[PDB]
Ligand binder design. Structure first.
Ligand SMILES: CN(C)C(=O)c1ccc(-n2nc(C(F)(F)F)c3c2CCCC3)cc1
Ligand SMILES: N[C@@H](CCC(=O)O)C(=O)O
Ligand SMILES: N[C@@H](CCC(=O)O)C(=O)O
Ligand SMILES: [Zn+2]
Ligand SMILES: [Zn+2]
Lengths: 260, 259
């Protein structure tokens, strides 16, 4: 019996510091969808756990030169954490080095605009220069554009990779702030889950436009061959079938909506 | 090196007989989304394969008395097939006896009505008596209602399990025909994928109403511990990331929609 080290990331509404966090200790400092999910997974799998925030604040990508993984993925690969419970996208390159449970949430890449921005689609962004657009660094959305052979997305990447000043951001919060402050001149490409959450938070000045660009899932990740992988997978399916995942999504997205 | 036996099911538009199937042979007799997907999975994983239609025409459930698995799940469990490539729902009870890849398609349980039926939600169905409703008699949708602790769905199951004559059907096609012939007095609970497909088929007299009741996925299934599982999983993720799954959905659902 060992305390499971959980790596996660501060990303609303998945993991957030409670208002009164400075007077709280350990796991009690945090709240959110992944905090609730971690508690459920641990209960069903019968383990005790410690939530830790990923040191470098990243999801995980592999450096092309050194081949070293960063982010939550790196924490699993190098044995610094036992499990990642976060909005971590299931991708081919990651599945090669870590294990993922069946998905607990669906999502797709989507477009965030400041309200009133005359953009309705990815096609619309790709055909103009007035409105800058970019993505998060070290995540699956950037890799999507880097790899896409779809004409519109390829054009978009050609623009984004060489754009000056840089259109990429270190955190989702930075991307959102950039939209809010840029008077309609920056659009942000981010996962529909995060986009839909921010759309329902004050100051209610952003919106999701167009359909999703792809369709994928977040999964709970463990190091390759971990003893926990099997149980975690079954727990995710149990929570899905009990309706708990739906309950948590309602709790953290729409029950907490502040744009009416 | 051995030919992989693929179990699948005749379910439109996943697997269908080609119009000229009697003058074709082997895998060439069939067409559809899962036929296209099987060819791709096989190419990427480097195996030869034979498509076979599940003998009993069922998805897979375990008999409460005999504890024997039927349908495509049974074919995997008892060693008759090496892989199932079909609209087979990932469920906990199945994942305990077979392996699933990461999902290749997302779906949820949904409501099919004859156009004009005064029903907009599961809540609506549960409150009234005039319009009967049911599910495929063997499958994950029936098990969803059987197991649900959610009040609306519990109410629906309490009605369905006791309705006479039976509100359950043997095939999706039977459920669809029942909606079409019942003048608005039967609604059919089925997966959103199959609902959305039929919505685009002549005579264009059905529609999907309300939100989905759950959210889940179909996966490619292999017998527990099979050597093929890892490669199949990586192939699904590659095909997802390359846009192929989206292309195949558009091909079989919308590009040739008749409405
Ligand atoms: C809990 N819910 C929402 C789900 O079970 C679910 C079902 C399917 C998916 N995802 N996941 C993936 C992936 F594994 F790639 F992430 C894909 C799908 C649907 C479209 C193809 C690829 C995500 C969640
Ligand atoms: N969920 C993403 C991070 C967010 C994004 O890239 O848009 C990942 O796992 O990399
Ligand atoms: N996809 C379902 C069958 C259809 C249904 O139950 O609605 C299964 O795998 O059992
Ligand atoms: Zn629970
Ligand atoms: Zn480097």
């Amino acid at each position: 019996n060992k305390t499971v080290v959980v790596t996660t990331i501060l990303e609303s509404p998945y993991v957030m510091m409670k208002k009164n966090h400075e007077m709280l200790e350990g796991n009690e400092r945090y709240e959110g969808y992944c905090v609730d999910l971690a508690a459920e997974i641990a209960k069903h799998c019968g383990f005790k756990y410690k939530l830790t925030i990923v040191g470098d604040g990243k999801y995980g990508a592999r450096d092309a030169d050194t081949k070293i993984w960063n982010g939550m993925v790196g924490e699993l690969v190098y044995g610094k954490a036992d499990i990642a419970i976060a909005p971590l996208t299931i991708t081919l390159v990651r599945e090669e080095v870590i294990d993922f449970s069946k998905p607990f949430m669906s999502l797709g890449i989507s477009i965030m605009i400041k309200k009133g921005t005359p953009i309705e689609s990815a096609e619309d962004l790709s055909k103009q220069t007035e409105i800058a657009y970019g993505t998060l660094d070290s995540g699956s959305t950037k890799e999507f554009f880097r790899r896409s052979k779809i004409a519109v997305f390829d054009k978009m990447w050609t623009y984004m990779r060489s754009a000056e000043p840089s259109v990429f951001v270190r955190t989702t919060a930075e991307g959102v702030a950039r939209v809010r402050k840029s008077k309609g001149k920056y659009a942000y490409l981010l996962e529909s889950t995060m986009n839909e959450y921010i759309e329902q938070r004050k100051p209610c000045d952003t919106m999701k436009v167009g359909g999703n660009l792809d369709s994928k899932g977040y999964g709970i990740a463990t190091p390759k061959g971990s003893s926990l992988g099997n149980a975690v997978n079954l727990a995710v399916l149990k929570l899905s079938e009990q309706g708990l995942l739906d309950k948590l999504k309602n709790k953290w997205w729409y029950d907490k909506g502040e744009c009416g």
